[PDB]
Amino acid sequence: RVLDATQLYLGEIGYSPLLTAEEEVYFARRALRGDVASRRRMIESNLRLVVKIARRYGNRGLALLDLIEEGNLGLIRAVEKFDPERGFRFSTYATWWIRQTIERAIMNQTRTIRLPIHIVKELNVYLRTARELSHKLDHEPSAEEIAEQLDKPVDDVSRMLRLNERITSVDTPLGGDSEKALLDILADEKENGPEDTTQDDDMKQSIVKWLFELNAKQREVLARRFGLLGYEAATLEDVGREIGLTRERVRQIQVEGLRRLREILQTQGLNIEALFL
Amino acid sequence: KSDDVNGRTKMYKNIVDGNHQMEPGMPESFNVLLKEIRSLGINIELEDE
Amino acid sequence: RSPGVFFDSDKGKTHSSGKVLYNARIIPYRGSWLDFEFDPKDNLFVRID
Amino acid sequence: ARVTVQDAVEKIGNRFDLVLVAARRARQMQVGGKDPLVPEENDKTTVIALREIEEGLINNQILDVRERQEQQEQEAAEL
Amino acid sequence: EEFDAIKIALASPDMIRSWSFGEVKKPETINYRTFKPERDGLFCARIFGPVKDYECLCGKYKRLKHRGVICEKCGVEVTQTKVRRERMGHIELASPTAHIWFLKSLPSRIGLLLDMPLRDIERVLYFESYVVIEGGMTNLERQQILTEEQYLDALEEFGDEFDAKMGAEAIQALLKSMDLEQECEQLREELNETNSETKRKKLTKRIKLLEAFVQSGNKPEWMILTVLPVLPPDLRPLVPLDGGRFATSDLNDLYRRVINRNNRLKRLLDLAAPDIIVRNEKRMLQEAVDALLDNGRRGRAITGSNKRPLKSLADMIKGKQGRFRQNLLGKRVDYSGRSVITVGPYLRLHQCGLPKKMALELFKPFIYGKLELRGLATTIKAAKKMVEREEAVVWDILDEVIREHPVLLNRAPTLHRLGIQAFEPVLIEGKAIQLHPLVCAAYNADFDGDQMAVHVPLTLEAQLEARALMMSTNNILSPANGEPIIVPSQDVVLGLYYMTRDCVNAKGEGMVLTGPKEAERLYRSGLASLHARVKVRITEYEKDANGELVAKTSLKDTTVGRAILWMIVPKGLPYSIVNQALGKKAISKMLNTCYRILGLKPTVIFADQIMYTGFAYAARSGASVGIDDMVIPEKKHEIISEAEAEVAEIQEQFQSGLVTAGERYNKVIDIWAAANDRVSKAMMDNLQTETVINRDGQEEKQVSFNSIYMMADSGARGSAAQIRQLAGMRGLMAKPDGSIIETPITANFREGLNVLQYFISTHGARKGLADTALKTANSGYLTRRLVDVAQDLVVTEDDCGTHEGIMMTPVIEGGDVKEPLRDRVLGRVTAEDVLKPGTADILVPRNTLLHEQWCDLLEENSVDAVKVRSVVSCDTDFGVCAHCYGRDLARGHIINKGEAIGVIAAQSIGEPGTQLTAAAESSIQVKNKGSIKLSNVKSVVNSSGKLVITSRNTELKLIDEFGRTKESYKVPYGAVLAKGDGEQVAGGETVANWDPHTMPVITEVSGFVRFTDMIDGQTITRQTDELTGLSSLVVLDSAERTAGGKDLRPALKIVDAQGNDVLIPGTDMPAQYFLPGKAIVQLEDGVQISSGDTLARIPQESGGTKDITGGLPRVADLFEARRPKEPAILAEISGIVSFGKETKGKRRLVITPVDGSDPYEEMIPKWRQLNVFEGERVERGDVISDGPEAPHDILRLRGVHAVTRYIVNEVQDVYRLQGVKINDKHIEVIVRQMLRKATIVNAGSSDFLEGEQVEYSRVKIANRELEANGKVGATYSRDLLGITKASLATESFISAASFQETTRVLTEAAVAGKRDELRGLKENVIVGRLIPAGTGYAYHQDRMRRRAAG
DNA sequence: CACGTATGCTATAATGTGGCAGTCTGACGCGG
DNA sequence: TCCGCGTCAGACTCGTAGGATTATAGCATACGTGA
Ligand SMILES: [Mg+2]
Ligand SMILES: [Zn+2]
């Protein structure tokens, strides 16, 4: 009843040939010259090596099979850049490549947000330092304590420990059992409440009515500047493009429109009422 | 009162305008349901009048 | 449940035959559970874990 | 009425149609600003329509007949 | 957008590509530093859209001016951010991937299509084994699995000219190559030649699948995924929490799994990797996609961060929590509030106290609106700040808005429709909601901290529907039974009782007054008690033949108090209503009477008045509790010491030898049970009465005014049962096993229980409390199954004009008529001009609503049986007619067309169950004189002279003079009758005695007794006694029995002196009585029996407690049509029968009809004994066997009204045992929904052929056009569906999916290419549209006619 | 050029995996 | 057909409180976009 993808694959690997030293040399010389069968046999025979390191690389990020596959990618590069001319054995060289490719994949696929290996490597040293500090300081490392030990900036240490924070699941509930999910607590913020949206509809509507209440030449340069009626939000000097074509007269008329409108808000009943807002 | 996004704002404006008219729409939960069924690879279409 | 042995019995339940099938359960504090049970045909069976 | 709507159900019959007809009439007064046949007496558009139905002034058929009349008057004016 | 229907079908690879706006190649979400979407990642802006409204990613185009302007540099469209919730993407899979839903979901479509077992397909998919796709050389045919080694063999020998492959590529090829047409014809050819019974079903099912596959235009290849769709970002969001951290959907983790492994597969293919590694990656890819679609179905679900399995796509749709049940069939709602409830006795029935601050908030837009029309607010934000400041003018405006505006109050749980009611709100200072007392019944509201939801109907339409349909005042009668729920209790009833109740003389006995006003003046003056018996002059107003009221003046012998209550009583009512001492039971009748005579507004005013007077006089009295209130019987210890020495004597006799544990258990329980009743009766005879009142001279006896007695007798609160354990004896307590403790609790609550009595009490108490928590949920699950099945049922037509009618008889069970025929046919349309005895003049017409007046006429004439029009027999297709249903019990008049009847039915059956969550029957004694009538009875005369019954179904009736049936009495088997058939008995005579414990096996013939097959240890057991040695035999059943005796039936056989078999009078049957489980025979073999003797005593243990815990499973079993283990046999067709073959003892009853020459032959168990004997002309459905009947068999042979009446009566038995009144018509609705579908034989002009299951309405429609035009006639047969299946058989898949089993429903609909036109209510509620019922029926019928043109 | 981000390469031999589910329960089908 | 793992179900609102963990080497050569 062998149904499990893992046990099936490990069955297939066991069913391979194990290679010797002189056999590795014969196959490796044929392999680099570009043999089909030599490449396949060297890879298939050394799969067991991938698994032994892949089994001791679990419970960190991906699953056993996931690590086994990426480790196998290391085996391929190892067979490609193996030197049979050097008297030294293959297993030693391959171990490097398999560990390299597994580690690199574990640094990328695990972190939900793609993080650079540069920041990750720095982080490693910060964490190792924390370990040594923890053994002697019965408490745990402060950011400042770590920064003093590496002779590096407090700000830089804090930035790094800020990228270490793991992501929480929103689909996962909090209220004891399954009473409410994090999704149902957390509201859509970029989206305004209907009360806020309706308030903007009233200001915009009021502006249209406020535009047909002042002077015809006082709401032709006050709105075409702010981009209220116009298409583009211009500045005091840029209102000259239309018909105004002035710098002094535009600035006097902008503020003249606002002063008469300030009295329109003092009389309707806003001014200091709508100052808090 | 719930999902209909356009509907809730429009009816709020009507109630301040004193119109007391509904103008209903389509609940956003249903739009999601459709997207979640298409994400399964089932074609679920609205057939028009 | 205290570790030790327990001798229990489905009072009917299984088989409208209505046979009382006796069972032993050995419960450790840590380890796999060791079950012994009877079958309608009076054959003694072991379930490991 | 004010308290209970039994009498207005007895005029039209179907509770469901009572609600549609009272709705349609209340909408006229709400939007069109149609004048109420009974004194308002500080009553909401919902209750006034029910008064008018109780007394037997408002009805699906009557409302339809006057809709045609105002609509034909407007056709006359446009042509 | 406004659409007609919805269809579901399999997604083509190319279809999936259409929705996609790009291929997501990378797992990259966003950049860690600029938290913006990565290149071609899962949140890519280039694919799903811009993060911010009308703004590209690199920021070159901003503002609403730039519209659809795809930025050249970054590649991001300038549109709204909303698009990222709607745009989809896709993924190019390297290997084809099977879609779990069509593979694993049972039965499965891929397997059923290939006719290939799942096991075979899986071996192929996980790359364990090759499958042959096609070999021209028949050497290897099709779908034949080859192992790794099997593939090497044929590959050398044949090779090339045979194609066998592995993985999903293989299955996709196998699906592509398969020709749907040709296999359809081949399978039709197979059914023609040799149709084997069980494999005809499976072949017809694959034929239906193939046909439906071709009609849908779905292609089998598409079951395997080449392109994989990607859900829009906002529907799987990555958002920043306040803490700086991010939080994301699990779909992101599952998509990242799939993309990583897919891209790695692309890599390993580019690199030409060895095939073992390619295979592993293809397995892992299929694992990741299957986890993404439906995690946990494909075995062990992928655990994320905590250990909890990741929530997949299907999990967001499926579960109760999915999207259907949680976000679509119910929602959280705006303009909603809640708070604690508290009394508002001052309120009128149509009002409720609504806290100021709560109402301020709920009506915010309505305030803003009036503020701007008065010009007090310049704009909305200024209006908001005026409300924030809570200015004095704002309160005055808020008062003005709330005027005549109804608010909905809701209490959980909402079991039935009255759990929501509308009120006119009354603004109150303080934070608690004030509820009117009289509606507390409907809500099941008690003010020990309950809370209520408030909801504001916004539209004019919603306001009107609240005021007219949902208003408190307008929902007085319950939707279930005609009896109303609105009725005061507690203090209100207590005060009315005190006043009404009259005491001896008191102040001013036997005075005379001018009307109730002199009485009131006398009482308030302090010259008269309310209980003074004095004659007053009152003028009652009785209605005449027309609308005019007649006035009548007469002297009445009542009390001061009742006269003063007459003042509240409206004109129309008789004075006799107030002349009794009033309780809650009498006041409910008073308000119902007033409603049916005078009408709604008068009863409304009268109800308020009753509440005001009731409270007012309730505080004027001042009864309470104490320590002496609970009177203890003086002769309690005398009955305790007697009972106690008695039980002691039997315990000493136990060591002697007359007693088993079971016998003494029964004897001690009987002694204590009788002692308890004795002490309770004496306690109730020293409390109810025992009032020495010296009347005006000498002593009298009258009713006690002891406080607790008045509370109980009035029905205000506690019952006699609660007072049994208060001042009386606590009684026998029952263990959690249900077996009763031998020592009862003689001490009560007043005297104080001992540590042991208290400890023993605990068991029952806690099981009660645990029952409320746990059992509520099965009750509620039944409500929900009922609701789903009867959602569609709506009143569609006024009169179908059918004469069909369910003949309803009077429920006269257990002497006293349980439910009268009058009340059973009250408010139902009559069928067939049914006049009086003398057939010569019509009394009643046809379709005529039975009003209380018609019903009163029926009682003078004493009509027993009436065919009435029923929902089940209604001809209306796609709903039911107002006439077949009858009165809306909640309204008190004919049902309105458009009312959603099914929902009301389901709610009204469901509610009581959810809310609700003496075995001395030895002798029948007859109450009234008459003659014994025994229907269905076959008894043998014993040597005593006495008629010993040996029938199973026996009905003793009591006929009077005229010849009506008035009392019934179920006589059992093994009974001694005092008198035989048609003999006169007097009042209070015993007519039959039987033992309740032990159903004896009574022999018909006389002779000697023989032990057949009764081997000791094999089949029976032997148990021996001392000195002489009495052995007793117990029949061990197959449960305790050895393998050896399994096949042997043990039976006491009657032989004569010669030792030949004695025959049963006049038949070929030799006497032999088959002994069941534990049949305890005393008398050992060879004992001369006389006839009519007790052979064997089977023990009848009745450990069942009369509660809804045991009743509801019976109700659920009836509604779901659960076939019993021993179904009752019935006659299929009419005709004359003789016996043929026998298997040892097993009967092969052979029916050979008179006209119909074909026989019908049945195999029958040996031990099952027949009611019929041999050659009788029996009709369709004559009862042959003893045992419970399957509703299926009833429908199939007798028909609709038979099976409907069986369900109605068997369900109603349970509810009636708990005192629950539900009208039959509700049960009838749901049975109609059960009998929705029908199987068809033969073809018509449509596509019926053999055994398609189609709905009854649609086949009737076909039959109507067929009969007019002709074509091939189609025989049909109605099928019964039990609730769950009936709801899944509905031709709306949106209702089927929302109900249950959503994954399976959507695969079957997707493969059929099914189209839902949104006919039902659930369907319309899901899309958020107008219901096709109530208000919506007008609008919905207008849309249906818009389908005819424009 | 440069900062951030990525791919790269190292040689004693080493070459088949392994943390829980705690038996819920009546119900109703789909292979042997 | 029958013993048997498999798969699908198990009232309605209110509340409370926030939330976790692990470790992946040192170094140089490299590819990508803005100034
Ligand atoms: Mg109570
Ligand atoms: Zn750009």
From Swiss-Prot, chain A:
Phenotype upon changing residue 125 to K: 3-fold increase in RpoS half-life
- What ranges are recorded for DNA binding? 236-255
Q: Coiled-coil annotation: which residues?
A: none
Q: What induces it?
A: Subject to complex regulation at multiple levels (transcription, translation, regulation of activity and degradation). Transcription is induced during entry into stationary phase and in response to different stresses. Transcription is repressed by antitoxin MqsA. mRNA stability is regulated by small RNA regulators and various proteins such as Hfq, CsdA, CspC and CspE. Finally, the cellular level of RpoS is regulated by proteolysis via RssB and the ClpXP protease.
**Note on domains (UniProt):** The sigma-70 factor domain-2 mediates sequence-specific interaction with the -10 element in promoter DNA, and plays an important role in melting the double-stranded DNA and the formation of the transcription bubble. The sigma-70 factor domain-2 mediates interaction with the RNA polymerase subunits RpoB and RpoC. The sigma-70 factor domain-4 contains a helix-turn-helix (H-T-H) motif that mediates interaction with the -35 element in promoter DNA. The domain also mediates interaction with the RNA polymerase subunit RpoA.
The annotated subunit structure for this chain is: Interacts with the RNA polymerase core enzyme and RssB.
Q: What is this protein called?
A: RNA polymerase sigma factor RpoS
Question: From which organism does this entry originate?
Answer: Escherichia coli (strain K12)
- Tell me the organism's taxonomic lineage: Bacteria, Pseudomonadati, Pseudomonadota, Gammaproteobacteria, Enterobacterales
The portion of the full protein included here is 53 to 328 of 330
UniProtKB/Swiss-Prot annotation, chain C:
* Superkingdom of origin organism: Bacteria
Quaternary data? The RNAP catalytic core consists of 2 alpha, 1 beta, 1 beta' and 1 omega subunit. When a sigma factor is associated with the core the holoenzyme is formed, which can initiate transcription.
Q: Which family does it belong to?
A: Belongs to the RNA polymerase beta chain family.
What is the documented function of this protein? DNA-dependent RNA polymerase catalyzes the transcription of DNA into RNA using the four ribonucleoside triphosphates as substrates.
Instruction: Please give the name of this protein.
Output: DNA-directed RNA polymerase subunit beta
Species in which this protein is naturally found: Escherichia coli O157:H7
Gene name as annotated: rpoB
Swiss-Prot record, chain D:
Spell out the InterPro entries in the cross-references: DNA-dir_RNA_pol_omega, Pol_omega/Rpo6/RPB6, RPB6/omega-like_sf
Q: Which UniProt keywords apply?
A: DNA-directed RNA polymerase, Nucleotidyltransferase, Transcription, Transferase
The record's section on SUPFAM superfamilies has:
RPB6/omega subunit-like (SSF63562)
Q: Name one Pfam family in it.
A: RNA_pol_Rpb6
Q: Name one GO biological process term.
A: regulation of DNA-templated transcription elongation
State if Lipid biosynthesis is listed as a keyword: no
User: Which top class of enzyme applies to this chain?
Assistant: transferase
Q: Which GO terms describe its cellular component?
A: cytosol; cytosolic DNA-directed RNA polymerase complex; RNA polymerase complex; transcription elongation factor complex
Describe the reaction catalysed, as an equation: RNA(n) + a ribonucleoside 5'-triphosphate = RNA(n+1) + diphosphate
**Lineage: superkingdom:** Bacteria
| Keyword Cell inner membrane belongs to the record | no
Q: What is its EC number?
A: 2.7.7.6
Q: Recall the GO molecular function terms of this protein's record.
A: bacterial-type RNA polymerase core enzyme binding; DNA binding; DNA-directed RNA polymerase activity
What the protein does comes down to: Promotes RNA polymerase (RNAP) assembly. Latches the N- and C-terminal regions of the beta' subunit thereby facilitating its interaction with the beta and alpha subunits. Part of the processive rRNA transcription and antitermination complex (rrnTAC). The complex forms an RNA-chaperone ring around the RNA exit tunnel of RNAP. It supports rapid transcription and antitermination of rRNA operons, cotranscriptional rRNA folding, and annealing of distal rRNA regions to allow correct ribosome biogenesis.
NCBIfam families annotated for this entry?
rpoZ
- Member of which family? Belongs to the RNA polymerase subunit omega family.
Q: What is this protein called?
A: DNA-directed RNA polymerase subunit omega
Gene name? rpoZ
Swiss-Prot record, chain E:
Q: Which UniProt keywords apply?
A: Acetylation, Antibiotic resistance, DNA-directed RNA polymerase, Magnesium, Metal-binding, Nucleotidyltransferase, Transcription, Transferase, Zinc
Which InterPro entries does the record match to this protein?
Answer: DNA-dir_RpoC_beta_prime, DNA-dir_RpoC_beta_prime_bact, RNA_pol_asu, RNA_pol_N, RNA_pol_Rpb1_1, RNA_pol_Rpb1_3, RNA_pol_Rpb1_3_sf, RNA_pol_Rpb1_4
The protein's name is DNA-directed RNA polymerase subunit beta'
UniProt-reported outcome of changing residue 769 to R: Resistant to antibiotics salinamide A and B
Task: Kindly state which reaction or reactions the protein catalyses.
Answer: RNA(n) + a ribonucleoside 5'-triphosphate = RNA(n+1) + diphosphate
Q: What is the effect of changing residue 749 to C?
A: Resistant to antibiotics salinamide A and B
PTM characteristics: Acetylated on several lysine residues in the presence of glucose.
Subunit field text: The RNAP catalytic core consists of 2 alpha, 1 beta, 1 beta' and 1 omega subunit. When a sigma factor is associated with the core the holoenzyme is formed, which can initiate transcription. The rRNA transcription and antitermination complex (rrnTAC) consists of RNAP, NusA, NusB, NusE (rpsJ), NusG, SubB, ribosomal protein S4, DNA and precursor rRNA; S4 is more flexible than other subunits.
Q: Which cofactor does it need?
A: Mg(2+); Zn(2+)
* Ligand binding (Mg(2+)): 446, 448, 450
Recorded E.C. number(s)?
2.7.7.6
Q: What is the effect of changing residue 721 to T?
A: Resistant to antibiotics salinamide A and B
Q: Name the positions where Zn(2+) 2 binds.
A: 800, 874, 881, 884
Q: Does the keyword Acetylation apply?
A: yes
Q: Which species? A: Escherichia coli (strain K12)
**Effect noted on mutating residue 765 to T/V:** Resistant to antibiotics salinamide A and B
Instruction: Cite a single Pfam family from the UniProt record.
Output: RNA_pol_Rpb1_3
The listed outcome for residue 676 to D is:
Resistant to antibiotics salinamide A and B
Q: What is the effect of changing residue 734 to E?
A: Resistant to antibiotics salinamide A and B
